[PDB]
Amino acid sequence: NRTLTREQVLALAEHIENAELNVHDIGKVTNDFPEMTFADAYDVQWEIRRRKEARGNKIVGLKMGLTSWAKMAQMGVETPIYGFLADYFSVPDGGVVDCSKLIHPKIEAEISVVTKAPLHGPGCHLGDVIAAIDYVIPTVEVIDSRYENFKFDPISVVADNASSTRFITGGRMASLEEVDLRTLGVVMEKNGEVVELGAGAAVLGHPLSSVAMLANLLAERGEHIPAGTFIMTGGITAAVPVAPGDNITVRYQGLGSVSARFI
Numbered sequence: 001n002r003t004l005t006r007e008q009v010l011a012l013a014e015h016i017e018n019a020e021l022n023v024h025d026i027g028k029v030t031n032d033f034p035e036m037t038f039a040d041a042y043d044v045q046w047e048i049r050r051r052k053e054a055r056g057n058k059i060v061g062l063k064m065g066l067t068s069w070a071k072m073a074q075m076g077v078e079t080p081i082y083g084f085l086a087d088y089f090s091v092p093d094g095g096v097v098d099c100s101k102l103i104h105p106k107i108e109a110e111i112s113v114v115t116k117a118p119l120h121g122p123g124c125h126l127g128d129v130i131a132a133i134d135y136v137i138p139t140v141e142v143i144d145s146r147y148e149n150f151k152f153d154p155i156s157v158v159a160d161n162a163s164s165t166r167f168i169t170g171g172r173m174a175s176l177e178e179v180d181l182r183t184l185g186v187v188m189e190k191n192g193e194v195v196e197l198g199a200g201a202a203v204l205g206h207p208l209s210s211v212a213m214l215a216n217l218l219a220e221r222g223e224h225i226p227a228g229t230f231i232m233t234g235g236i237t238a239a240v241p242v243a244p245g246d247n248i249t250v251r252y253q254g255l256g257s258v259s260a261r262f263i
């Protein structure tokens, strides 16, 4: 289920990573490799991860994309996608984000978890995930597809590390006992204006399901979710474009807020 030669995987990873590192968009790689499979794309993504680890970057978490059934159906895929988070993606609450290093960023309000027990697929579901959750963390992702197109293409997006670029953690880190992740409300404010509202249920119906799906996806490549893994479970709100000069704050009910300023 792979159509790329290894040379192509390596060349694509370099090409796609450079778009991120050098802050410029590129054509969707499925335009030059229309037969690219998800296995191909994950090979490319994991190769980008390897490139980053090889230069000393710590991989500090994972994120989940396409965590909406409606969006999956629209894309004609049956599962979400994942990407990894590198250490330098991290932005502190209230932190300043330099858009000169970004292409056309948007933010998404998410709830992250840190696990305290290993999780694996296949066949992982909500019930298997609950005991393994240590705490939850309000997290705003900054996504920034390195592709210049308008169509979301899941395979290219996977190769592009699911458009990962920054994540902003903040608010209170709460145990699962304190939080109903389905009804967890978020309010995204941009420049003083409420621009998106959402509830955790927007992530598959239950954000923790995203963790189970991640375990299942990782299991396809013979990986799992080790205890202590930080996982951004998916966009609760529609993604909101940001630009220099923007200030955003996302309030999480009962868990404080996550803010960032863009320059």
Ligand SMILES: [Ca+2]
Residues within 6 Å of the ligand: 063, 064, 065, 108, 110, 141, 143, 232, 234, 235
């Ligand atoms: Ca996201």
Ligand SMILES: [Ca+2]
Residues within 6 Å of the ligand: 093, 094, 170, 171, 256, 257, 258, 259
């Ligand atoms: Ca805050």
